[PDB]
Amino acid sequence: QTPYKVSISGTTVILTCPQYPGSEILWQHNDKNIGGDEDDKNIGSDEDHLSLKEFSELEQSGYYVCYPRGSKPEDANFYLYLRARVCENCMEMDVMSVATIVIVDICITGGLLLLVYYWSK
Amino acid sequence: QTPYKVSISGTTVILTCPQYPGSEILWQHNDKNIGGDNIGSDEDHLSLKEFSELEQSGYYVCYPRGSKPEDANFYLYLRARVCENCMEMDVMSVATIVIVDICITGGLLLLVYYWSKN
Amino acid sequence: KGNHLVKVYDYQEDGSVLLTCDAEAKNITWFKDGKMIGFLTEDKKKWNLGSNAKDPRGMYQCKGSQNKSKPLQVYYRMCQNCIELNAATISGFLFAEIVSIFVLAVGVYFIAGQ
Amino acid sequence: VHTEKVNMMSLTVLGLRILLLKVAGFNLLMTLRLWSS
Amino acid sequence: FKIPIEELEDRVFVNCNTSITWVEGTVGTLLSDITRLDLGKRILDPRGIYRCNGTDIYKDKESTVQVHYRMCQSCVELDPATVAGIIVTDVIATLLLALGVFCFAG
Amino acid sequence: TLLLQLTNTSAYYMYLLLLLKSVVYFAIITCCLLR
Amino acid sequence: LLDPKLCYLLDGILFIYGVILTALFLRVKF
Amino acid sequence: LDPKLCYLLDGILFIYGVILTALFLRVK
């Protein structure tokens, strides 16, 4: 029900929770409240989702919570345990993508050669 | 200054700590007393042969005899990985070999062209 | 103890090296190879160097509140360039060079005004 | 022990091999364009 | 209420107090007897949305965990300079090959 | 794996060297072409 | 890792190139 | 296995291919 989406790009992570959109939400992890206090500028919460930069393997890599005001922290029924080997300027590519791009490159090169040879007439 | 120098070649690691005009200079490693008599230990180097990665790394302090192991000058924190023989190409070496090969191919190809033109 | 407060943290499976200076002061900066480069702001005392791939070096001082802190060092040489020298790689190098030279020589011979 | 940059080297060696193939084909093609064979 | 997760050697376990009812995710290598289930290798990058029921002190509660590991192994660190140079040299080389085939065709 | 990095670096240097050789060959043939 | 698979893929492509062209050469010489 | 064998076989295949290319385009 309304799963979390940890979308990441390079060293930065975008983490959003669609459990209850359209309300103030402070997400606490490991028994302390980490919301919007401008703390360290690393947690950027714009409207609902809070982003982290300079992610570390040890700290801030654990549980997570979503709930609005009024309700207590010990009320929410969801918990995200994410461990992220956060890496700088990198992505995941299987062999299939490289094979596809190589085949495409060879094909387009051959097509261009044939086109030029045809134009040579 | 005290430019702590480490040179690693092959599987043997040697090093130097220029502070000494001639003394006992005792060595330490995470509170261990590496050296003496086996484990490599020289007057100036330590000759770390069979240098594996996980079992042998950490602090290394050069402090002469008769002094506490704390009021020494520097450390090095040597961390290294040795496969077997290998070698490390700095950009100077690769530039040198590229230039040498350029010279070789240019000379030989020009000579064979001169021969074939005849 | 005395004068020695520079601890490098390790035993992490990812490629990162970092320092800790256990001093109690405000905005303790970091020296480097004898001229000052880095600067510390509060809420952190974790002046990271990056990754153990660029082979960090040099002597680092954090200005303790008495006079100074003498360095430790940094030296990381993992493998980066690792050309093997067995009876396979050097033989392959010689063989490939000879083959390429031979093919180009044949081509040039054919090239010469014929 | 990390496998982060070995993939980068294996990806760039493929680019180098494809460049070598293209340039060798080009050079052979022109050399034969000249004359003789 | 949380779902404890610990890695003994190379396996991520999920056990809270009792059997865990998988609802969507990864249900692969499991030593399911009554309590602990794991998902084999850590490097395998395991994900999934899980569940477990009331525990010793907490009856009739239901809290869910969501493992979203990212231990990338097929994972490449692209250097912008290197990739840019490779792609530009590749396109230059293919244009040069076209020029060569044109010059030969005549 | 270490062996993969070993072989990969050796082969990268080898292929760069081969491309470098083919470049000077191209230079010679194009000098012949223009003349 | 992907190096073995990539090398064998490129080798397969080059072998296909070799085979088609030797077939064409055999056609012309015949 | 080992990538070394793969690369050696690739080089042999490449030289064979270039030689056959030269012969084919010479005859045709």
Author numbering:
A (entry chain e): 33 to 153
B (entry chain f): 33 to 69, 74 to 154
C (entry chain g): 26 to 139
D (entry chain m): 256 to 292
E (entry chain d): 22 to 127
F (entry chain n): 271 to 305
G (entry chain a): 26 to 55
H (entry chain b): 27 to 54
From the paper:
To investigate the role of the cholesterol-like molecule, we introduced a number of structure-guided mutations into TCRγ9 or TCRδ2 and evaluated their functional consequences using our cell-based assay. However, we successfully identified two strains of Jurkat cells—one carrying F283A, F290A and F291A in TCRδ2 (AAA); and the other carrying the TM of TCRα (Ile254–Ser273) replacing the TM (Met273–Leu292) in TCRδ2 (TMα). These strains exhibited comparable levels of TCR expression to those of WT Vγ9Vδ2 Jurkat cells. After stimulation by APCs, the Jurkat cells expressing the AAA and TMα TCRs displayed significantly lower and higher CD69 expression, respectively, compared with those expressing wild-type (WT) TCRs. Compared with the WT complex, the AAA complex displayed elevated cholesterol levels, whereas the TMα complex exhibited reduced levels. Considering the functional properties of these two mutants in T cell activation, we propose that cholesterol bound to the Vγ9Vδ2 TCR–CD3 complex exerts an inhibitory effect on TCR signalling. By comparing the structures of three Vγ9Vδ2 TCR–CD3 variants, we observed distinct conformations in the TM helix of CD3ζ. Concurrent with the absence of cholesterol, the proximal C terminus of the CD3ζ TMD undergoes a lateral shift of 3 Å from AAA to TMα complexes. Here we demonstrate that the binding of cholesterol to γδ TCR–CD3 exerts an inhibitory role in cell signalling, possibly by modulating the conformation of CD3ζ.
Gamma delta (γδ) T cells, a unique T cell subgroup, are crucial in various immune responses and immunopathology. The γδ TCR is a heterodimer comprising TCRγ and TCRδ chains, discovered in the mid 1980s9–12. Each TCRγ or TCRδ contains an extracellular domain (ECD) with a Vγ/Cγ or Vδ/Cδ domain, a membrane-proximal connecting peptide (CP), a transmembrane (TM) helix and a short cytoplasmic tail. After antigen engagement, the γδ TCR–CD3 complex triggers the phosphorylation of ITAMs within the cytoplasmic tails of CD3 subunits, initiating downstream events.
